[PDB]
Design a protein around this ligand. Structure first.
Ligand SMILES: NC(=O)c1ccc[n+]([C@@H]2O[C@H](COP(=O)([O-])OP(=O)(O)OC[C@H]3O[C@@H](n4cnc5c(N)ncnc54)[C@H](OP(=O)(O)O)[C@@H]3O)[C@@H](O)[C@H]2O)c1
Ligand SMILES: NC(=O)c1ccc[n+]([C@@H]2O[C@H](COP(=O)([O-])OP(=O)(O)OC[C@H]3O[C@@H](n4cnc5c(N)ncnc54)[C@H](OP(=O)(O)O)[C@@H]3O)[C@@H](O)[C@H]2O)c1
Ligand SMILES: NC(=O)c1ccc[n+]([C@@H]2O[C@H](COP(=O)([O-])OP(=O)(O)OC[C@H]3O[C@@H](n4cnc5c(N)ncnc54)[C@H](OP(=O)(O)O)[C@@H]3O)[C@@H](O)[C@H]2O)c1
Ligand SMILES: NC(=O)c1ccc[n+]([C@@H]2O[C@H](COP(=O)([O-])OP(=O)(O)OC[C@H]3O[C@@H](n4cnc5c(N)ncnc54)[C@H](OP(=O)(O)O)[C@@H]3O)[C@@H](O)[C@H]2O)c1
Ligand SMILES: Oc1cc(Cl)ccc1Oc1ccc(Cl)cc1Cl
Ligand SMILES: Oc1cc(Cl)ccc1Oc1ccc(Cl)cc1Cl
Ligand SMILES: Oc1cc(Cl)ccc1Oc1ccc(Cl)cc1Cl
Ligand SMILES: Oc1cc(Cl)ccc1Oc1ccc(Cl)cc1Cl
Lengths: 260, 254, 260, 255
């Protein structure tokens, strides 16, 4: 009004990991756009470029700056972020919403996990944050905010989660280490731990429907969450409201983290 | 982010009170505020301190959280005077000087229980009474410290009272989440306040944050009030039982 | 058969909180008794004095030394421990297995808890470690080890547990503060976080039967724990085998803590 | 109690001051038969001399580089064939490139990150798989971690992320393998002067901090870790699994 203490209006954020309209990264987009932020979107699959194009109705007026980045490729993220920088100039944060593991590994007994599948999960689900934070920083000379999305399975052993649990525990340590390293550069680093939400990747998690229902009967709030509730915490964490907050993990999960 | 909401802020002593940073932040965001204080002789710092933008009173009620009557009658009166409410900010704690000074194993039964009473149980009754004024739901926030999670040098009995308060929060959040009332804590980094004088070696704890916290700077009262505004508002829709550390990232290191 | 790594065998341990033979503290006594230790027992109630005398076979010779101590009274625990010292000389540790809350409270909606109810639970389940630790330390000139008994309800908001949940978060912080304080005195202080066991006190917990069957179905080891399992970890903590362990909380719970 | 008739595979001995050597000493004294594994020829030759000690052969020294599926599978089959089936594994293996640990976390190379995970974290997963084949009635697996897996500690970097991963590996393994009556647990050891420790920047300051700030006001040694390991490896820790015990003078529990 200005209740720009948010300060996020006419600042630019990069949102990585929109697949389709149920993507967590999409509820983030929706909430930042509404608050006046300029947005740059990166994707891996050509199908996700098409959904982005159709999705950007909504309020951003170019492009909304659609770049192709596979986090497995050092080259693609170095050169993707260099190009963002040349095309829109400097950046104020990044929302990271990228994970992957093989369906077979997740199914599927943990002690049987292959080396390639263990390491693939760490590659895409954890390390990607680290090169991404490194390349993005370059476009952030007076600081900024990076936010990654995690699951309670990085903190506790959860039934069908297997190798992804381990990849999230690793993501979560990566966040604190990036926070200590990038803090003197006025960069904040944080995670949202989201409750379960029906998305494209979610149907690769076994017993997914049973866990929805557990939150419903068991979480403090006796409901589950949606993408725009994550988006609203992303907005806090990306804004100046979270000024004093780094290395932290915010559960947007109806309070399930706090119970039994 | 907006006006139209009424929040009760408990625990302003003066201009450096954490609950004053909260006040300021909520006032700028357009909230109507209600203020509690402990003793009738300091009603007058307080009205004087409250310029600021609130237009009456701003609704000042005397509540010593040790009395069951005073919390009940107090909130009763608040609902009568201003109607019903959106949230509460809790920023009260106390322990005896001689307890915190003071080897922990030497603590007395009554000084132990006094810290528990004032720093912990008060969130319980206040949440019960405040709920009566929150028929669509709302948000309750309490202020805690790192010494509730970890044994910290001269914190002693308050350390145990804060871990009490932190478990207090989680349980209230379970009990009250069906009523649509969310309950969260903010673990604040060290801030120079009137009550800070009771914490031994305070210079050394601030210098430690500068040298060691990710941010390499101490936090302020308004920084707390900003995370409080997130917590109190709809911004934090799915969050309850949580403890947001507003402390330059110190909770996360070594 | 030296251990003698354990270093338990001609040593005196005060055991507080035996009601009958299914008391978690009785699991402790049978295990230290087996390991060669001298034992001192404290009771509150009369009913436990007759319970204790009969129960005290086993292979402990005198009384073995039974003191009435009600942890609500400063005098009882100062004089109690002062008597233990006159009668047996100095001591090597304390097993603390004492807690109480009004059943009306745990019943029970947490926000409705009375102030007397809440402070009662704190006094007995939490403050009691602090004077006991203080009074016993006067019999441990050379150092020593003190263990209290906790529950997952101290870390997570659990359905029928309420004010006791809050009293166990407090106890656990009490163990950490006492470790920091008493460490330079070479007194280690630690907690065991026990899973559910059918004891006389377990009556006070609504739906105990249900939290029994959940451990068995969900806990890594797919089974419940018994009192001698807690006992063995208590031997471990009381012994020199845990020589470098202080302020710690060990979960004897089949792995329940580590999941979901 | 606390005895013989048990057989433990101990992995990660380099020299007289390897943490796992402290574990070996403690177990050796408690009557166990010890099988040892090593990567470098250098370490085998340190093992042979260290074996004086009580163990009467070999003790059963096996070359196993946890980087090859093939060597951990073939090594454990051979351990099977040579000493029969087993009662537990003590795992003390970790690696990171020195450049990394120096060395600003945000600059970490992809390949340095995945190397830390491969050797420091995944190794427990396959070790557990192959070990389990020699433990038809159950047993106990212990891995060695460090507070830096829980908190961003100064020069620790890529190794802290690999221990965070390790620490989760233990919990998920515990859940998977607990029906099979196998317990899995970690010991979070305080800082101790070992071959690999001198790869950690400012170790010497991270030593003296424990002595001034830890409840106990001293650091620990390899044998204190071996006494906890002895607890975890034996039935004395019967109901305990997916747990992390800090043998660190209480450091984990303060400020
Ligand atoms: N939904 C839930 O309950 C659930 C529960 C808890 C925590 N989380 C966390 O939420 C985050 C986002 O997932 P979502 O549920 O919103 O699913 P989503 O719609 O399926 O999208 C996941 C995104 O990951 C991207 N991605 C995968 N590998 C990539 C690579 N190598 N390079 C670049 N992008 C890659 C995918 O890109 P392409 O489509 O272009 O391949 C996709 O856009 C995940 O990190 C998840 O781990 C979600
Ligand atoms: N300063 C910090 O470093 C610090 C940092 C970390 C987290 N925490 C937590 O933040 C909270 C607020 O403290 P502060 O530092 O902002 O100090 P503060 O300005 O001195 O405020 C403390 C408030 O507690 C009130 N209070 C004490 N006993 C009471 C009782 N029986 N009934 C009603 N009110 C009572 C005091 O009222 P009167 O003065 O009017 O009597 C005072 O207004 C406390 O909960 C504290 O434990 C504070
Ligand atoms: N049983 C379990 O499932 C269980 C499980 C997980 C964690 N925990 C924790 O385990 C601990 C041990 O209880 P338990 O289950 O073994 O039950 P128990 O056999 O009922 O023993 C409880 C002991 O508390 C004593 N006590 C209560 N108030 C006292 C006082 N004011 N002064 C002296 N002694 C007092 C009782 O003595 P009198 O009968 O003579 O009054 C009794 O000896 C409790 O602290 C509990 O909080 C318990
Ligand atoms: N010392 C400390 O204070 C420090 C303390 C905090 C926690 N921990 C944890 O302690 C554990 C044991 O280390 P330590 O300090 O005792 O070090 P150490 O004596 O240097 O032993 C490290 C061991 O790791 C083995 N290793 C490395 N890469 C391997 C590979 N690819 N395959 C098989 N073995 C491999 C080494 O074998 P080769 O020599 O044959 O190459 C060596 O025996 C580590 O996991 C560490 O992370 C130690
Ligand atoms: O589960 C996933 C699996 C993959 Cl391969 C990729 C993304 C995923 O996202 C999630 C979906 C549902 C829940 Cl409960 C947790 C997470 Cl991390
Ligand atoms: O310390 C206090 C002591 C009392 Cl008797 C009352 C309030 C207090 O408030 C604080 C001030 C500074 C820090 Cl570091 C932590 C806290 Cl809980
Ligand atoms: O629950 C209790 C309640 C009271 Cl009034 C006294 C002792 C208790 O002891 C217990 C018994 C069972 C479980 Cl599951 C947990 C605990 Cl702490
Ligand atoms: O530091 C290490 C570095 C490497 Cl590459 C391998 C093993 C190590 O072992 C340690 C030694 C000291 C401390 Cl404090 C922590 C750890 Cl994990």
């Amino acid at each position: 009004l200005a209740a720009a203490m948010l300060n996020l209006e006419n600042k630019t954020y990069v949102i990585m990991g929109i697949a389709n309209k149920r993507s967590i990264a999409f509820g983030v987009a929706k909430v930042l756009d509404q608050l006046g932020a300029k947005l740059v979107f990166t994707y891996r699959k050509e199908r996700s470029r098409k959904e982005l194009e159709k999705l950007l109705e909504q309020l951003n007026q170019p492009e909304a700056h659609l770049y192709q980045i596979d986090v497995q490729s050092d080259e693609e993220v170095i050169n993707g972020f260099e190009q963002i920088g040349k095309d829109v100039g400097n950046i104020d944060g990044v929302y990271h919403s990228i994970a992957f593991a093989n369906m077979e590994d997740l199914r599927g007994r943990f002690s049987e996990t292959s080396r390639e599948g263990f390491l693939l999960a760490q590659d895409i689900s954890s390390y990607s944050l680290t090169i991404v934070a490194h390349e993005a920083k370059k476009l952030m000379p007076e600081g900024g905010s990076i936010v990654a999305t995690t699951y309670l399975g990085g903190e506790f052993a959860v039934q069908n989660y297997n190798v992804m649990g381990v990849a999230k525990a690793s993501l979560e340590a990566n966040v604190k280490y990036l926070a200590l390293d990038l803090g003197p550069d006025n960069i904040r680093v944080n995670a949202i731990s989201a409750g379960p939400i029906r998305t494209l990747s979610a149907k690769g998690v076994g017993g997914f429907n049973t866990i929805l229902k557990e939150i419903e009967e068991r979480a403090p709030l006796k409901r589950n969450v949606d993408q725009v509730e994550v988006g609203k915490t992303a907005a806090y964490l990306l804004s100046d409201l979270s000024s004093g907050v780094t290395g932290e993990n915010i559960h947007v999960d109806s309070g399930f983290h706090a119970i039994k």
